[PDB]
Amino acid sequence: ASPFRLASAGEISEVQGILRTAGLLGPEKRIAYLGVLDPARGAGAEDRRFRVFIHDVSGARPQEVTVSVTNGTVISAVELDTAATGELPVLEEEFEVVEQLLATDERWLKALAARNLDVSKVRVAPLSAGVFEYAEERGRRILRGLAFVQDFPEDSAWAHPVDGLVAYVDVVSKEVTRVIDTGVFPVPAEHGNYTDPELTGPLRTTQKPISITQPEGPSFTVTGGNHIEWEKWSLDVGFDVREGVVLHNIAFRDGDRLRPIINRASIAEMVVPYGDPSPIRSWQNYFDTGEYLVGQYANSLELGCDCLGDITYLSPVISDAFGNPREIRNGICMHEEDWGILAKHSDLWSGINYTRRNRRMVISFFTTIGNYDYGFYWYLYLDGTIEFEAKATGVVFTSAFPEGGSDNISQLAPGLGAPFHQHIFSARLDMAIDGFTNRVEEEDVVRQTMGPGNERGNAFSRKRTVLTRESEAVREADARTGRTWIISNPESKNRLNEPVGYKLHAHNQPTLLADPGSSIARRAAFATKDLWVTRYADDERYPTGDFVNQHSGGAGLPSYIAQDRDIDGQDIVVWHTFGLTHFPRVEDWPIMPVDTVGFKLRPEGFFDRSPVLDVPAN
């Protein structure tokens, strides 16, 4: 019975019961986060621990609590000073509170009346506050509000942003702290209803079906609920309400030895910073993972359109606000798909023609965070490659388009704007290349000058620089010199006496653009550099720290790195920053075609020859 198994309904019911018998979960208390802790290093009988963040709707200070579900006990419980360590993640039940409060506020009603907007039709997005110049918000749980008109129940409100207007609200005290009206902007009038035949036109009748089937079923097996074996790979698929799908114990069976590669892979944070300097939006930075918890909003994915082919679904269970278990039905898709040619050669001299097909194992989920929808895909390939891809879609976040244009906003439709922004991800890769004794080298291509030893000026080379200590392990991209990062095990040698390794291949997209002195540069410090390496510690889980909401800065990676620990042949963690810089285009409106970003790792002397010689002819 695997200690990395998914949380069961019964387990969550029991932490609820333990928090009840123990005295911490009455009415007025509400769970802002609940998840299982990974087993400790070396222990592996089992002790299933859950960690819980408890909010206080009666305004008392929140608690961080660790419970043992195996022994039926509270391991620890500590009161939180939110002004110091940060506010708890946004609750789903607060998604409506911003709108409901504002609907009876005279300053808000006056702003709506000036624009002739019916209050019954004004939707207000519950938007994270960050930390700016407002002293009264320190210690207070604040959400900011931007308004969108919905003309009728099925209307897309994103088509009708109300610019020049923003409200700040305290969601514990149920007070409106501020209403800011800098002037009326026309509310864009065209609708963005992408299911309306008026807008779609007649639907295409030209697409013939593509049937993908597996008459003998899939080549992977699922045992113990979430243990996958596929084509030499083995792993455990976890799920957490903050991170979403998490991969554990990624290993590869090389002959008869199960060889670890990655101990834990996750998307540990993702931030969406906006680059419109208008006071109406200039505070806007959404930490979809750390503030909102992307796992909790995972869609129930339907067969034949979200996931095509022979699909095996996991239905993860999470906690509601009161500690009752809630299933995300068909929340995780697992399937294998063809991936074209793996290897091919037609040899003149031998007469031998050889072709083999590639395939990949896909483990995915899709989440919706307000207007955004994101797919998170992990891929394992026959040849040992590991890949992540994020697919970004949904509806773009809108504003008015100013008369006489903008350097910081795109026009989508008449009067309709889309502020510039980025989506930046952090992949946390707890590495275990042939076990835990690992190190990282930065590899650059090296150009050589024509001269003695290189008389024709054709020579080129490479250089590798070991990252020895955390203070040296904050690295940037250099696409021009083909910069990559190799994680090796200096005590595990391949048959050519070279240390075994994996090479991280980044897309080299721009990192965080904000000025280095900005609030967002301090709070999302991770996003300013492409690659970070830390020494593993059990309490260093997120690059932005445990409590991101209204936390002032420096938390997470920059504080971790400051310990300056030895990472040369030690248990280490790689943190890869990657993202999309989005200047919205007309083609993104009224619903955005998928765009993608990601990274991959390829074996680099890990194997003793190609690991796919034993793949059969098709």
Closest residue by Cα to residue 105 from 172, 168, 186 = 168
Least distance CB 231 / a copy of itself (angstroms): 6
Beta-strand relationship, 285-287 and 312-314? unpaired
* Residue closer to Na ion, measured from CB, 374 or 536: 536
Least distance CB 423 / a copy of itself (angstroms): 13
- For binding to Cu ion (CB under 5 A), which residues are involved? 582
Contact partner, 180, from Cu ion, a copy of itself, Na ion, none, Cβ < 5-8 Å per class: none
* Residue closer to Cu ion, measured from CB, 64 or 443: 443
Least distance CB 273 / a copy of itself (angstroms): 7
Least distance CB 278 / Cu ion (angstroms): 17
Least distance CB 74 / a copy of itself (angstroms): 36
Contact partner, 582, from a copy of itself, Na ion, Cu ion, none, Cβ < 5-8 Å per class: Cu ion
| Residues 390 and 425: beta-carbon distance below 8 Å | yes
* Residue closer to a copy of itself, measured from CB, 43 or 135: 135
Give the E-state strand segments of 459-591 in sequence order: 460-466, 474-475, 484-493, 499-506, 531-535, 572-582
Contact partner, 538, from a copy of itself, Cu ion, Na ion, none, Cβ < 5-8 Å per class: none
383 counts as catalytic: no
Residue 291 φ then ψ, to 5°: -90, -45
Q: Residues comprising the binding site for substrate?
A: 286-297, 369-374
Residue 391 φ then ψ, to 5°: -110, 115
* Residue closer to a copy of itself, measured from CB, 322 or 354: 354
CB-hemisphere CA count at 13 Å for 500? 23
* Residue closer to Na ion, measured from CB, 155 or 430: 430
- Give 102's DSSP letter: H
Least distance CB 264 / Na ion (angstroms): 8
* Residue closer to a copy of itself, measured from CB, 164 or 603: 603
608 counts as catalytic: no
Helices in 384-479 by DSSP H: which ranges?
none
* Residue closer to a copy of itself, measured from CB, 53 or 425: 425
Task: Rule CB under 5 A: choose which of 571, 585, 612, 615 binds Na ion.
Answer: 571
Closest residue by Cα to residue 543 from 524, 530, 566, 562 = 524
Burial tier of 55 (Cβ tally within 10 Å: 0-12, 13-18, 19+) = buried
Contact partner, 59, from a copy of itself, Na ion, Cu ion, none, Cβ < 5-8 Å per class: none
* Interacting positions 494-553 with Na ion (CB under 5 A): 536
Contact partner, 430, from Na ion, a copy of itself, Cu ion, none, Cβ < 5-8 Å per class: Na ion
Contact partner, 571, from a copy of itself, Cu ion, Na ion, none, Cβ < 5-8 Å per class: Na ion
**3-state secondary structure at position 143:** strand
* Interacting positions 422-451 with Na ion (CB under 5 A): 430-431
| Residues 108 and 176: beta-carbon distance below 8 Å | yes
Q: What is the 3-state secondary structure (H, E, C) of 17-51?
A: HHHHHCCCCCCCEEEEEEEECCCCCCCCCCCCEEE
Q: Which of 33, 168, 372, 379 is catalytic?
A: 372
Closest residue by Cα to residue 137 from 293, 277, 283 = 283
Q: Residues comprising the binding site?
A: 286-297, 369-374, 421, 423, 582
Q: What is the 3-state secondary structure (H, E, C) of 110-121?
A: HHHHHCCCCHHH
Residue 317 sits in the site that holds Na ion (CB under 5 A): no
Least distance CB 346 / Cu ion (angstroms): 17
Q: Any idea what the Cα angle at residue 540 is, between residues 539 and 546, rounded to 5°? A: 85
Contact partner, 415, from a copy of itself, Cu ion, Na ion, none, Cβ < 5-8 Å per class: none
**3-state secondary structure at position 274:** strand
Positions marked active-site: 288, 372
Q: Which residues bind Na ion (CB under 5 A)?
A: 430-431, 536, 571
